[PDB]
């Protein structure tokens, strides 16, 4: 069943990847807000 | 120097001298002069095309300088300023003052501190503003 064991591993790994992507986007958004505030 | 410049009719230069005088006087814990100078300059600067954008800031300081006197007059002064300069409502300053007033109305020091920390995190605070906020928090 290691054949499907790897499918589950890939699924969970992409879950982790999506989490990281969302966190990176959020940090970006915050940085944008900061710079946009600063220019004024 | 400000009196001389006013006697020379060269505006926008006596203004800066008056702002410096008011800012320094506010440090000495004498608030009436600071309030008067800040409000006078703000009301003068509302009508200027270029300076209009900055006018709001002055009001903020005045209200903060009006905060140490007592809470109630600060609230009523906020109302008076807002009715005269409705755009002032849009600025984060009004929201921050309202939140601080609400927190202090129930002795909720933790909420006041959290709001101050959040605002500083978004934009770094000045030493003058830091000192004024600390002095207010003493109550």
């Amino acid at each position: 069943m290691a054949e499907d064991a790897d499918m589950r591993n890939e699924l969970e790994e992409m879950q982790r990847r999506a989490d990281q992507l969302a966190d990176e986007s959020l940090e970006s958004t915050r940085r944008m807000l900061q710079l946009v505030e600063e220019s004024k | 120097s400000a009196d001389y410049y006013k006697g020379e009719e060269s505006n926008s230069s006596a203004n800066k001298c008056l702002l410096k005088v008011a800012g320094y006087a506010a440090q000495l814990e004498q608030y009436q002069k600071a309030i008067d100078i800040y409000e006078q300059v703000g009301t003068s600067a509302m009508d200027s095309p270029l300076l209009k954008y900055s006018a709001k800031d002055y009001f903020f300081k005045a209200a903060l300088c009006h905060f140490c006197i007592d809470m109630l007059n600060a609230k009523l002064a906020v109302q008076k300023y807002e009715e005269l300069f409705p755009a002032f409502s849009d600025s984060r300053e009004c929201k921050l003052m309202k939140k601080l007033l609400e927190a202090h109305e129930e002795q909720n020091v933790d909420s006041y501190t959290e709001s101050v920390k959040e605002y500083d995190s978004i934009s770094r605070l000045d030493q003058w503003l830091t000192t004024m906020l600390l002095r207010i928090k003493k109550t």
Side-chain angles (χ1 to χ4, degrees):
Chain A
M1 209 270 285
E3 196 305 314
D4 176 28
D6 69 45
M7 169 151 111
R8 205 217 269 203
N9 306 339
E10 303 139 27
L11 263 287
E12 303 142 323
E13 165 51 26
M14 52 175 268
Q15 313 295 95
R16 309 156 217 283
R17 266 279 317 291
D19 311 352
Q20 183 285 331
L21 264 286
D23 287 85
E24 203 58 36
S25 34
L26 189 65
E27 282 300 287
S28 303
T29 45
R30 289 203 261 278
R31 171 164 39 264
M32 330 328 301
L33 174 53
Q34 177 164 27
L35 272 156
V36 163
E37 256 275 20
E38 274 181 57
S39 310
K40 216 142 46 157
Chain B
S1 91
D3 165 34
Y4 279 136
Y5 269 131
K6 194 88 75 163
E8 190 46 281
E9 296 75 60
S10 63
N11 305 14
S12 198
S13 164
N15 269 10
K16 92 194 193 64
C17 290
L18 297 201
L19 279 297
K20 296 289 300 319
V21 161
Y24 268 128
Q27 184 50 93
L28 271 61
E29 305 291 83
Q30 40 181 247
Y31 298 68
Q32 188 54 52
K33 274 183 77 201
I35 299 148
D36 174 24
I37 295 289
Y38 279 124
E39 65 191 30
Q40 196 285 329
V41 165
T43 184
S44 182
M46 303 150 28
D47 272 351
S48 149
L50 303 148
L51 280 145
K52 133 176 184 189
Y53 300 89
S54 90
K56 69 190 191 59
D57 202 325
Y58 307 149
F59 296 149
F60 167 90
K61 261 144 179 197
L64 255 182
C65 178
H66 211 158
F67 210 50
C68 285
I69 298 289
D70 71 332
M71 286 333 88
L72 298 153
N73 311 335
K75 218 165 176 310
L76 275 61
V78 159
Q79 258 83 59
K80 169 152 59 141
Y81 294 138
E82 204 167 347
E83 89 201 337
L84 176 53
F85 197 84
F88 188 34
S89 198
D90 81 343
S91 67
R92 318 202 283 144
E93 287 78 335
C94 292
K95 285 88 162 178
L96 171 53
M97 301 215 178
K98 290 177 185 301
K99 183 133 64 176
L100 293 200
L101 268 169
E102 273 169 13
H104 193 56
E105 277 298 347
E106 276 58 44
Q107 304 250 5
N108 190 317
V109 305
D110 50 294
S111 157
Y112 168 104
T113 316
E114 152 274 318
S115 283
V116 164
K117 151 165 72 72
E118 174 273 320
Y119 179 72
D120 185 284
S121 150
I122 285 285
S123 155
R124 313 311 319 293
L125 289 169
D126 178 17
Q127 176 63 1
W128 189 92
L129 290 175
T130 308
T131 294
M132 142 54 75
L133 279 161
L134 170 138
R135 175 128 68 258
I136 281 291
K137 158 173 273 153
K138 152 67 192 177
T139 295

